[PDB]
Amino acid sequence: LQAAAGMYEQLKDEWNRKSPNLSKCGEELGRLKLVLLELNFLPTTGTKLTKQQLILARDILEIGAQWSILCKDIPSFERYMAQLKCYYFDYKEQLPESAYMHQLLGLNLLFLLSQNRVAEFHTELERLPAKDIQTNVYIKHPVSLEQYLMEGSYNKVFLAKGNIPAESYTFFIDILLDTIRDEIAGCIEKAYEKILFAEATRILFFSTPKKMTDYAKKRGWLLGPNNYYSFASQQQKPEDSTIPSTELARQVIEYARQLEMIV
Amino acid sequence: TRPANHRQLTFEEIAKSAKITVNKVELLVMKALSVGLVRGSIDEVDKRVHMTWVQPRVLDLQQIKGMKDRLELWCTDVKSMELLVEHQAQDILT
Amino acid sequence: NQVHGLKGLNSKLLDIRTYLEKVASGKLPINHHIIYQLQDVFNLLPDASLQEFVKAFYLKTNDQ
Numbered sequence: 018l019q020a021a022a023g024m025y026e027q028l029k030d031e032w033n034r035k036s037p038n039l040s041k042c043g044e045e046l047g048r049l050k051l052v053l054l055e056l057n058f059l060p061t062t063g064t065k066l067t068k069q070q071l072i073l074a075r076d077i078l079e080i081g082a083q084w085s086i087l088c089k090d091i092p093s094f095e096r097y098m099a100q101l102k103c104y105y106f107d108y109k110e111q112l113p114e115s116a117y118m119h120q121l122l123g124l125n126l127l128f129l130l131s132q133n134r135v136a137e138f139h140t141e142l143e144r145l146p147a148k149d150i151q152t153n154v155y156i157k158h159p160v161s162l163e164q165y166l167m168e169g170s171y172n173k174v175f176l177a178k179g180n181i182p183a184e185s186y187t188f189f190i191d192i193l194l195d196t197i198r199d200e201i202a203g204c205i206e207k208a209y210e211k212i213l214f215a216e217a218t219r220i221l222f223f224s225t226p227k228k229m230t231d232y233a234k235k236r237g238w239l240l241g242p243n244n245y246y247s248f249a250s251q252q253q254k255p256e257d258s259t260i261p262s263t264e265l266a267r268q269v270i271e272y273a274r275q276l277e278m279i280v
Numbered sequence: 281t282r283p284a285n286h287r288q289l290t291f292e293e294i295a296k297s298a299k300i301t302v303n304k305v306e307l308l309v310m311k312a313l314s315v316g317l318v319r320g321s322i323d324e325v326d327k328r329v330h331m332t333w334v335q336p337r338v339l340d341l342q343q344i345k346g347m348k349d350r351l352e353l354w355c356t357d358v359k360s361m362e363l364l365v366e367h368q369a370q371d372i373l374t
Numbered sequence: 375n376q377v378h379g380l381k382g383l384n385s386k387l388l389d390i391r392t393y394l395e396k397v398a399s400g401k402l403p404i405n406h407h408i409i410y411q412l413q414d415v416f417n418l419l420p421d422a423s424l425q426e427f428v429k430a431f432y433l434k435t436n437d438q
Contacts, residue, residue, distance in 0.1 A: 271368055
């Protein structure tokens with residue numbers, strides 16, 4: 018039941034640039050729970066008869082989810098998305114579907130990569146196979162981005178895109194940039210013995226040389242354009258035939274005794 | 281002193297203390313390996329002496345103290361290990 | 375036999391150990407034999423090394 022506006026569809030009209038006030042939006046979240054009690058009444062009491070009402074219910078909570086991550090409210094985006102999760106495949110089908118469900122799916126998928134919750138992305142994909150549930154324009158962008166991470170194809174990764182739609186997609190991509198940056202520092206630490214400043218700016222995706230100086234010393238790298246971490250450790254690992262060891266095949270002492278119990 | 285804990289020692293300190301040349305200190309040291317007064321090798325690829333075994337000089341009070349504290353550490357080790365061997369293959373052991 | 379060996383070894387080491395305490399203070403004689411034995415342990419430095427395993431056991435029960 019959405020009719021009129023002061024807490025019903027008030028949030029919806031706010032999300033537009035008609036009234037582009039965010040200042041009202043902070044207050045709105047407490048009031049929206051009051052209209053939300055009523056909205057909750059319709060799903061799995063009636064189904065089709067209640068259809069119109071569902072559409073409207075979902076639109077306010079979903080459109081406000083996008084508008085309360087331009088207020089940068091983290092707890093709000095997740096609890097709306099969570100609420101609407103069941104609305105995606107509600108019962109048989111309550112049909113609360115909105116255009117905005119299309120963007121939402123895409124926002125959640127970028128959110129999960131920034132948080133580094135790859136397991137959840139995969140779990141969502143298994144629900145997803147018939148991707149004609151809202152089609153692929155905003156869902157195609159997260160899947161390409163996940164592959165690129167996956168591959169090691171860091172150059173391709175979008176840190177240049179997703180800042181360009183400014184509705185709610187920007188919030189996830191800014192944090193993600195820190196995460197990929199860290200990921201490069203680790204790969205390079207084990208991989209290669211030196212790093213230059215000509216080298217560094219591009220690979221870590223630093224903006225400045227000052228950022229380079231900061232990130233390298235923490236790890237312990239910095240000595241100049243020439244350092245030596247990697248090389249020495251890579252060489253050291255084969256041969257423990259002249260040097261005592263017990264590593265692999267477990268703890269030996271247990272190992273011999275266990276082997277004999279089994280047979 | 282140094283051999284016991286870790287096997288190898290440099291040969292350069294011993295020649296200078298001798299105050300006699302390098303080509304004649306080796307000679308006496310080889311003779312010492314031969315009789316069995318000391319056992320081990322002289323490696324001139326790095327100019328160090330690797331001692332396998334050292335003689336313990338006899339009737340020294342200090343040495344008795346030294347072996348005692350070591351011995352207690354070994355005793356612990358036996359007990360620690362013994363509980364583990366019985367834990368697995370206990371069904372088989374009875 | 376292995377477990378029997380550990381409790382047994384442990385007894386031998388106590389004899390030496392209690393003796394040293396007694397020689398150092400209480401003035402029991404210093405014999406070359408006791409000292410020779412102790413020194414060798416440090417010197418030999420045994421190094422753990424590979425080998426001795428087999429996988430045959432399963433095939434035989436399967437056949438039967």
